[PDB]
Amino acid sequence: REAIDFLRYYAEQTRRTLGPGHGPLGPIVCISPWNFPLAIFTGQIAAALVAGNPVL
Amino acid sequence: FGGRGLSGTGPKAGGPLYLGRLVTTAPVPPQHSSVHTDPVLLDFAKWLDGKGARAEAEAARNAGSSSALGLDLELPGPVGERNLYTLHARGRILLVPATESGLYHQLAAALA
Amino acid sequence: PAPFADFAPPVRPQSTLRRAITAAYRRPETECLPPLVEAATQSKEIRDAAASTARKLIEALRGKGVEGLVQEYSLSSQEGVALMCLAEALLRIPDTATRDALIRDKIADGNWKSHLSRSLFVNAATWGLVVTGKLTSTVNDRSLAAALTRLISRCGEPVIRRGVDMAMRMMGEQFVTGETIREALKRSKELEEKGFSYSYDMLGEAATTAADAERYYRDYESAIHAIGKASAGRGIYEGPGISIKLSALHPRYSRAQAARVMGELLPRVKALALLAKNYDIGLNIDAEEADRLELSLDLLEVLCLDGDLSGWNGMGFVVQAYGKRCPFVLDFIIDLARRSGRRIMVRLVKGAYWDAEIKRAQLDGLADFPVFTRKIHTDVSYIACAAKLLAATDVVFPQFATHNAQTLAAIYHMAGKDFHVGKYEFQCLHGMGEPLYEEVVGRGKLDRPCRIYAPVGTHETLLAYLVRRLLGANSSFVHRINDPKVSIDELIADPVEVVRAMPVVGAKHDRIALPAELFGDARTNSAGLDLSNEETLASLTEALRESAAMKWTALPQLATGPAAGETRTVLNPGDHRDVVGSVTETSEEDARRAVRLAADAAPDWAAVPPSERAACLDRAAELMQARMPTLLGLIIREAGKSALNAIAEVREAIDFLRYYAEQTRRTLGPGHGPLGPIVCISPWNFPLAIFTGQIAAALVAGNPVLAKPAEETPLIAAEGVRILREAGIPASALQLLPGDGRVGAALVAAAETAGVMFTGSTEVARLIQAQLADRLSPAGRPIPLIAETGGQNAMIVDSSALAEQVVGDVITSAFDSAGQRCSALRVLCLQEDVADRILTMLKGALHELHIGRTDRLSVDVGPVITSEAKDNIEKHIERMRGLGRKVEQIGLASETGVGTFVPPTIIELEKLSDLQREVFGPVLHVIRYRRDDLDRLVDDVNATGYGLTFGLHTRLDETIAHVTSRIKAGNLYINRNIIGAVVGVQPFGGRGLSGTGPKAGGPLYLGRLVTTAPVPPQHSSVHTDPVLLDFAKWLDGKGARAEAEAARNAGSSSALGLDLELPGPVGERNLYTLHARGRILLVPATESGLYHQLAAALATGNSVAIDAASGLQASLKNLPQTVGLRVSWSKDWAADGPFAGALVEGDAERIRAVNKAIAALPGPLLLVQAASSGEIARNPDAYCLNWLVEEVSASINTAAAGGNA
């Protein structure tokens, strides 16, 4: 559920905020832990992706 | 979710400042504003006016207005719970200026 | 001239029909409804038929703008409001190509702020209503600025373009029919061809100056020509007409100014009507506030009887069905139509001022409302009045203005089958009612005509009252037809049958308080008097005349009986030929005897249980209420007050009596022993209310009182004492000692005087302070002094404020009571971009004031109290004039020669510091400020050292937050005048040079008048000062365990941070908060005493200055930085001030010595608390935390945007 929530939350935050002047950083390295191996994994990746950055 | 000090850098995950850190110009998050103006920022702006540092005084007043310090929101959630989100001062900010005008702008940002 | 012989004569003798109107003014709602229900009743067959027609109309309305924009660009509510505000501002750019360039090149590229002295969001409350349907009194301009930046950065130029085009259509085609009458007339041809007609509303309203009324006249005259030319002989039923508001045509349109209205406003309406007659068009008189209804009837009567207007039936008049007088007004108008033979056009409406009528009746303490309190009652009233109108179509032309399809259907079937054009019509609002009435007009529908009420005006004009026009309320029909939660069956419900079947027909709304019940179970509100009610004016006229025939006296009323002395007369300040009465002044020996008598009787009065002492006060309030008309006449003639201000003063005295009685019943027990004899010294400017309040508080707290009234106004004081004694206060508990400062000084100096309550000048208060510092109580403690003194009160106005509203509040604040209020507005601060416009309006409004002897209702401003006050005030004005400052003064009539008058005066200053003394008269000073310098201006206001009342006019939350957080004043007022603080609602009292506190009419007041203070109602705080907490940890680190525990107990017992909303009228929020006082002077003797003093001061939020002569510096080594920030040491106390209070430790002689040194400090009179070392060890309450916090009252007008959410 937390993974789903991160995806939908950062999707909605994007729809509320990002326009052409909010340029991406570029490649983002996302390093996640073993204790929330889907939720934190998904949240960091979803946020970097939806902001326009490719993710490692 | 997320903390201060040895607990992390922020901004909080699953909160409205998060995406702004992943772009080179941060947007204005939803509901991110405050009607409060730091009173020390105000005193600094008047001091800058006294010195004739007009561009800096203007930048200080603009920082005092656009600061979201004192934001205090209730977030939608389940019944039987009250979920609150507030923005406070961070602490002491390290300023590393190169020029006098740069120092004035940095002070304005931190005081506001 | 005989007193009150010309007080308020009616325009004409009141006919039987006019008397029935006045009789209904505030009739109980249970009495109004049954006859309306009976008159609105229709047959079962007609009710079924009407339900069917209304269902049919509502079916089409539901099967047929900003919302599509919000959807297309996924805007939040704040983004939609911000966008519409941006669009409005872009539309203020006249040239299209320039505007489009700003959008494309500079706005859409961000940094909208750089390109657009006035907030973008001044009108956001109005757009908020458009976008969200909800009303906000003030604007969160920081939220809107964030939303605007977000939406522009997200969607760019396309959303700006759509917003501009949307705003252009709404403001140019929907909220108005057109920007000018010519454009409105061109756009009316479409619907006239379909069977509609038009009435044009030139959006004129509430003239403030003669020049404004002149502009409104020529605007109406020019529209009449354009409409009459366009009408081209179509006549008053087929062709267009005009609607006017009488308040647009004269700046003093009120019953109080009825003579000016009949002499100056009437000929202007006649000249417009003569032009409407020549073109043969309708001229409708719109209905306004309830207190203007009957005055407007006097103009309607003269016009309908004027032979010069004969032959024309175009004159029209609005009647509001939400008003209790509506059927009786209609009876009167129908009779007038019969007598004059003019077929009066009667526009029946529900009414547009409902929220305002509720608030006004509550503020004025009147018996009831002049409007209904349940929407369904107004609906029944409308249908009943339609039945009366439809029975008189031969002599009047009814015009049923309504968007409610149920109301429409009921009237359509009530009118029956016979119809011809000219029999009656419906009416609707432009851009609102056409949907409904396109199902009505024409042979294919109901074949009944509809006249469109068509606003005409620019964007500026339209926006000024758009809020009122939208109120859109949850109960409104158009809100419900567009609410999916409401079925058709709910919409076609018969309000007559719903009301008929309610348990109590016509019961008041459960959630609206009658004015008497504003405070619920706590106490009974005082009742006022309606000076727009002819019966009240006639009865008051007789009482005032009878009051001037009484031989008023004031004598030294000692415990043993009246005493002899030097007797002289008391003169009316407006006319020294009018002798009001005689005063016998007290000898210094008898004043000293009086204190000893009070001392001897103190145990007996202290033994009367607090409840019974409070019963005395409640009995006195009842007596003053019943005697108000007689008290009015005395106050008018002795103190020079207007009748309006005298009513408020008697109300205040009643409120003080009832408030302190209730506070006594809430608090006082056997452990709160009285101080002893208390000397009460009261001023001449509120000679009954402040006099009563000080004496009532001291008495109900168990103290015997020596009452020293101002030398100028002993008569009302003597009458006050008479009433208190009649109410049961024994003569030994309340002695009256008339006389000058010798009497006051003898009383203050008497050894048995245990406390002094003083209201007056700072100069005298400082002399009393020095006298008292000579003495100690028998317990060896300072004599308490409550000293309430003047203020140099300011109002700050920014470019978002509404000029008309500002000017009215400024005129009232500065010149009411000839500026002889402690709260009066002395300095007006105008943002530079609007200063010239507001000053022009202010000067014009100044010259509309009537100055003279106050025994006429028409007088706005009376005399100043003495020739000495006059000379002092005029010397100031001439100094300012001699310095080249601009000085505006109204000319005075020759009759003022027999009294002491100062004309209301406006003086334009360069800097606030140009004003170097308090000027206690009708003298307003004006300064201008640049917006960026607002924070410095507040600094300048604070720097005077005064801190009584302060006003702010702004719509912007950021400016409200800033200014109210930085200003240092006891009574704050937002978007209203700054005078007339209401007991228990705006507890009154300032800081600094303005007073010691505690606030009069507030919950800390009685506790100052007993040896051990009680816990006031609601007096607590869950907040703990964090510097106090740091100090308590430091004390524990030093091993001072007992002190550390006392510090934590002080942190919990402090009420710093209390934040309450006080009950009061609707449309206002009244807040009461406890803040730190400032820097407290600490004069310790021992290390432990210092620690206890520091804890008390820190727990209440204060900084401290510790006497360096104590030698206790080594007692505070290694203080935490947070505590060090609040601690200073002082060798020269006078140099390190001002202080906000003091704590002293010592034996009796040390306390007396320190108390004298404190009294010699320049500036504010310090509230000093003293204790011995042993007392600090034995009594945890040795220092009382009540006196280490500052009370702040804030009153916010939440109706200021044009309505009450």
Ligand SMILES: Cc1cc2nc3c(=O)[nH]c(=O)nc-3n(C[C@H](O)[C@H](O)[C@H](O)COP(=O)(O)OP(=O)(O)OC[C@H]3O[C@@H](n4cnc5c(N)ncnc54)[C@H](O)[C@@H]3O)c2cc1C
């Ligand atoms: C053509 C035209 C001309 C008008 N001229 C004037 C004018 O000169 N003067 C004037 O004062 N107004 C005027 N009005 C406004 C009118 O008085 C109504 O208030 C408004 O138009 C709505 O009434 P309704 O029958 O359309 O809608 P409804 O939803 O049926 O009625 C709403 C009305 O109910 C009343 N009401 C709401 N709440 C309560 C309550 N709690 N207790 C008692 N009553 C309540 C109010 O009067 C409110 O306006 C005019 C309206 C029109 C269309």
